[PDB]
Amino acid sequence: SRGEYVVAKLDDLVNWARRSSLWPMTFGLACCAVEMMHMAAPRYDMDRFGVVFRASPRQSDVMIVAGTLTNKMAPALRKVYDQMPEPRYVVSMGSCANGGGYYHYSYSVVRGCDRIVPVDIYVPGCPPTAEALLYGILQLQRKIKREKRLRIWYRR
């Protein structure tokens, strides 16, 4: 149908922009954030793909939870996630962010950042290499490529 074709093209265009312009919030917790710096480094330059760190959560699209999430830190992470406007995505990085990690059976560690925020991508490793994190970012981009919001709305 003409309307179906129009909405398909429009949300192909919309998903392309969001996929190609990703702005992670400048947010790192532990040793996993060093591999974020090495992904930002010249070797695996993240700025090629349109992935740029922004300090303010208002101007951020993705939250890369890279490090251990503690009980004393969970409210701040939830606060910045809430203050991030939509559409927003979450990439947990490393064992600590995925589940508990080396500190799973601890009194002061949250066993998974997905207990706090909805996580879109999980990156495995301790720490995941910069290439592993880049693969996770590209996988997030491909996940964005498949979103059909206007197509869902047209048939709604």
Ligand X SMILES: COC1=C(OC)C(=O)C(C/C=C(\C)CC/C=C(/C)CC/C=C(\C)CC/C=C(/C)CC/C=C(\C)CC/C=C(\C)CC/C=C(/C)CC/C=C(/C)CC/C=C(\C)CCC=C(C)C)=C(C)C1=O
Ligand Y SMILES: CCCCCCCCCCCCCCCCC[C@@H](O)O[C@H](CO[C@H](O)CCCCCCCCCCCCCCC)COP(=O)(O)OCC[N+](C)(C)C
Q: Contact residues for ligand SF4 (CB under 6 A)?
A: 30-32, 67-68, 94-96, 101-102, 126-127
Instruction: Tell me the Ramachandran region of residue 101: left when phi exceeds 0, alpha when psi lies from -120 to 50, beta otherwise.
Output: left
Q: Does 12 bind ligand Y (CB under 6 A)?
A: yes
- Cβ proximity to ligand 3PE: between 102 and 153 the closer is 153
HSE of 109 in the Cβ direction (CA atoms, 13 Å)?
18
Beta-bridge mates of residue 66: 93
Flag whether 113 is marked binding: no
Positions touching ligand 3PE (CB under 6 A) are: 10, 14, 149-150, 152-153, 156
CB of 73 to ligand SF4, least distance (A): 12
d(CA 156, CA 148): 12
Selection from ligand Y, ligand 3PE, ligand SF4, none that 9 binds (CB < 5 to 8 A by kind) is ligand Y
What are the start-end ranges of the E strands in the chain?
A: 62-66, 89-93, 121-123
Selection from ligand X, ligand Y, other proteins, none that 77 binds (CB < 5 to 8 A by kind) is other proteins
d(CA 90, CA 63): 5
SS3 125: coil
Query: At 122, which helix (H) or strand (E)?
Result: strand 121-123
Q: Does 14 bind other proteins (CB under 8 A)?
A: yes
CB of 50 to ligand 3PE, least distance (A): 16
Q: Does 9 bind ligand Y (CB under 6 A)?
A: yes
Chain residues binding ligand Y by CB under 6 A are 9, 12-13, 16
Binding annotation for NADPH: 156
